[PDB]
Design a protein around this ligand. Structure first.
Ligand code: AWY
Length: 485
């Protein structure tokens, strides 16, 4: 391990150099560029400062202590260096949490409003984060959980001092931010796919001829049934995916009610033959229920969306649910299950939301849909059309910034995943897990987390076009001089 000592010194030498130069460039680039001068990027400046703190005083002492093979400085120099390392690591994960919340609210704001998301309170949330990070690192001085570790030649937070302090540090300052951020970028990725998936040039009301009342009367006549509140279902027949079984059980509940005579049902799909029989059974017993097992054209489905009054989406698990959004394009008021994706698309103003897997509540939701006059429906169709219109509005946008900030988080998660995992293993039995954990695994977990501090500016340049432009802009301005001929 003689060479392993010099190699460890190189990793830090690289980190210190790239951090000091790189994160200083990030601070300048945001102030210099008008494109990067937005309020939502105050967190980026705050995260870069957190990265700079460790390369100025803690890391340099750790670098000497590799060569010295011990702590040749005081106890205050150990307690303070461990403290600034805390504010940095804890500050970095909460700043990344801030950006993840900021960017999720940004897509939601651009959907509901024509004006861009201002990020007006960005400076206040940064100060709140630093008051939170200080409140978590500060009690480690009095408890005495900060001490030198010879293996990693540094003064850090010892995971073997108090297991209660480590479990709280792993849950509240790693597992808690991780969940918040993974959920945020999950909801962003769905909304970007919904923007991608919609086609306002195909699913357009223009393609339809006469009035909705005339087109509904025409569609119902061809199916052999008179005028009424027409409901539609479209999707494969399955016991626990698209929930055709929930709809079928609900029609039976409604068949006895005097309100059923004023209803019309057009079920479309194919799957489980038992469900296919159940549907055809009600088609016989009731003349207001029509089943289509055949595959209908995208052109005809578009005409159906434009003619029917409602579209029932009783799906158990629907992640995107473009069908709900496609129906809204042609004024079909959706009645859908409160599932992830459908919860995003359907507003309380646009459609009716119901609990997934309940035929009772769906029957009452279909009843609520029936207890609505021609005047009430016309505004609901308008809102449905306006909501689908806002999704296509975001199509020309450059979603490249969301990828960079996601890569920033992804890399942070890789660097600190072993350190927080070892911290849980050590928390089980501190006396037993000290030799049970391999030395290479302990050293690698710590130095990965150290290298992370210089990673963020390298990522900004290789992915964000505006950052790469301003890096060369500042570099050339200080290299080249001014002279007169
Ligand atoms: C919890 O507070 C601190 C205070 C100082 C630190 C200094 C260096 C590194 C860490 C993270 C090590 N925590 C885990 C759970 O692995 C610190 C954490």
């Amino acid at each position: 391990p003689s060479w392993l000592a010099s190699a460890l010194a190189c990793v830090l030498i690289f980190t210190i150099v790239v951090d000091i130069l790189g994160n200083l460039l990030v601070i300048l680039s945001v102030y210099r560029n008008k494109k990067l001068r937005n309020a939502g990027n105050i967190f980026v400046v705050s995260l870069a400062v957190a990265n700079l703190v460790v390369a100025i005083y803690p890391y340099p002492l750790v670098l000497m202590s590799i060569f010295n093979n011990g702590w040749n400085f005081g106890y205050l120099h150990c307690q303070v260096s461990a403290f600034l390392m805390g504010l940095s690591v804890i500050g970095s994960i909460w700043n990344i949490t801030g950006i993840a919340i900021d960017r999720y609210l940004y897509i939601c704001h651009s959907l509901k409003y024509d004006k861009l998301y201002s990020s007006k309170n960005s400076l206040c949330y940064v100060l709140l984060i630093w008051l939170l990070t200080l409140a978590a690192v500060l009690p480690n001085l009095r408890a005495g959980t900060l001490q030198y570790d010879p293996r990693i030649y540094s003064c850090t937070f010892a995971q073997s001092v108090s297991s209660a302090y480590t479990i709280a540090v792993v849950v509240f300052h790693f597992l808690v931010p991780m969940i918040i951020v993974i959920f945020c970028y999950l909801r962003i990725w769905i909304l970007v796919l919904q923007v991608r998936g919609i086609d306002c040039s195909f699913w357009n009301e223009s393609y339809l001829t006469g009035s909705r009342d005339e087109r509904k009367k025409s569609l119902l006549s061809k199916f052999g049934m008179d005028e009424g509140v027409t409901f539609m279902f479209i999707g494969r027949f399955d016991r626990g995916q698209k929930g055709v079984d929930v709809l079928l059980k609900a029609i039976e509940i409604l068949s006895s009610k005097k309100e059923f005579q004023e209803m019309r049902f057009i079920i479309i799909g194919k799957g489980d033959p038992e469900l296919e029989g159940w549907a055809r059974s009600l088609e016989e017993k009731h003349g207001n229920v029509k089943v289509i097992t055949e595959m209908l054209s995208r052109e005809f489905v578009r005409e159906l969306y434009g003619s029917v009054d409602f579209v029932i989406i009783p799906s158990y698990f629907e992640p995107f649910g473009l069908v709900a959004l496609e129906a809204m394009c042609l004024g079909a008021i959706p009645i859908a299950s409160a599932v992830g994706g459908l919860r995003d698309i359907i507003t309380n103003e646009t459609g009716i939301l119901v609990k997934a897997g309940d035929p009772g509540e769906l029957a009452n939701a279909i009843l609520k849909a029936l207890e609505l006059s021609r005047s009430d429906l016309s505004k609901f169709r308008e809102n449905c059309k306006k909501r689908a219109m806002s999704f296509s509005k975001l199509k020309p946008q450059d979603f490249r910034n969301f990828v960079t900030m996601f890569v920033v988080f992804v890399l942070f998660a890789i660097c600190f995943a072993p350190l927080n995992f070892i911290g849980l293993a050590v928390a089980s039995d501190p006396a037993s897990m000290v030799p049970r954990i391999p030395e290479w695994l302990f050293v690698a977990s710590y130095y990965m987390a150290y290298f992370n501090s210089c990673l963020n500016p390298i990522i900004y340049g290789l992915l964000d076009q505006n950052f790469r432009k301003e890096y060369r802009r500042i570099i050339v301005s200080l290299c080249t001089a001014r002279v007169f001929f």
